[PDB]
Amino acid sequence: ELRVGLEESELWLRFKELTNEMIVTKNGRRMFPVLKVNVSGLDPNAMYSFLLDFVAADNHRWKYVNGEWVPGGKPEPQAPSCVYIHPDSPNFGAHWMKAPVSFSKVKLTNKLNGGGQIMLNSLHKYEPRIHIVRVGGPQRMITSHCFPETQFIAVTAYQNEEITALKIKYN
Numbered sequence: 001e002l003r004v005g006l007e008e009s010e011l012w013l014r015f016k017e018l019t020n021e022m023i024v025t026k027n028g029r030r031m032f033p034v035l036k037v038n039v040s041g042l043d044p045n046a047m048y049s050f051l052l053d054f055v056a057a058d059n060h061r062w063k064y065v066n067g068e069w070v071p072g073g074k075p076e077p078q079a080p081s082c083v084y085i086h087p088d089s090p091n092f093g094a095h096w097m098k099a100p101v102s103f104s105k106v107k108l109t110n111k112l113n114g115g116g117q118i119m120l121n122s123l124h125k126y127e128p129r130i131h132i133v134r135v136g137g138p139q140r141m142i143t144s145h146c147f148p149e150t151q152f153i154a155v156t157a158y159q160n161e162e163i164t165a166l167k168i169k170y171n
């Protein structure tokens with residue numbers, strides 16, 4: 001069975017219990033913590049591409065009001081985010097299973113941009129999601145996995161200084 005696990009869940013859970021935040025910029029900012037995924041049960045010899053996207057966890061705008069994140073009352077449907085291809089793609093099962101698949105080079109932006117960068121809506125809450133796509137093979141196959149532990153609100157600057165401190169402590 002294809003097994004997908006989150007590396008350093010311990011640390012992600014510290015961020016999550018405070019409400020995690022990720023900076024977005026016009027040029028695009030890398031993520032801390034980095035999404036690192038443990039994958040077992042691939043065909044070592046089959047060919048796969050690893051895809052990352054961000055699901056809008058709800059349809060609301062969030063604001064930091066008197067030291068607390070609170071959703072707006074005016075939901076709007078959230079268009080699905082663009083997909084980031086792990087730059088090791090495509091590659092053999094063996095490659096993907098020999099070390100955690102680490103999305104260290106994805107950049108989160110607030111502006112439609114050249115390419116690579118993933119545009120998110122500021123003050124929306126996001127749930128990272130991967131797709132493992134069997135490529136080249138006779139039968140195309142996709143397996144998808146969500147990472148609740150890695151939810152965050154996209155921000156142009158940190159609101160909760162407890163997050164600022166955790167980010168610095170662990171970077």
Ligand SMILES: Cc1cccc(C(=O)N2CCC(C(N)=O)CC2)c1
Nearest residue numbers: 048049050051085089090133135136
């Ligand atoms: C058919 C399929 C499905 C999913 C992912 C891929 C893939 O790994 N790339 C990377 C290289 C290319 C690019 N320009 O980034 C796009 C296709 C291919």
